[PDB]
């Protein structure tokens, strides 16, 4: 209401962006809640064993 158009616009753009970010980061988090956090399939087992070294 009292807030100017600029402030309102930017606070909405920021709100929506933050919400979207959290949404994305918290929807590809299913394989971890069900089974413990372990790397899966045939490829990620090499990248891991390399980043570790």
């Amino acid at each position: 209401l009292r807030l100017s158009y600029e402030k309102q616009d930017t606070l909405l753009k920021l709100l929506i962006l933050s919400m979207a970010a959290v949404l994305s980061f918290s929807t590809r988090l299913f394989a971890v809640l069900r089974f413990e956090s372990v790397i899966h399939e045939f490829d990620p087992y090499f990248n891991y064993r390399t980043t570790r070294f």
Partner: protein
Amino acid sequence: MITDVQLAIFANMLGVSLFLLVVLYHYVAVNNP
């Protein structure tokens, strides 16, 4: 920790709210002075 069902419900609510907010933002955008 957090039940799978709980996370799914939270994801659904967040997505629906984010889409309604995006529509509201379009309405505010057009309404610029």
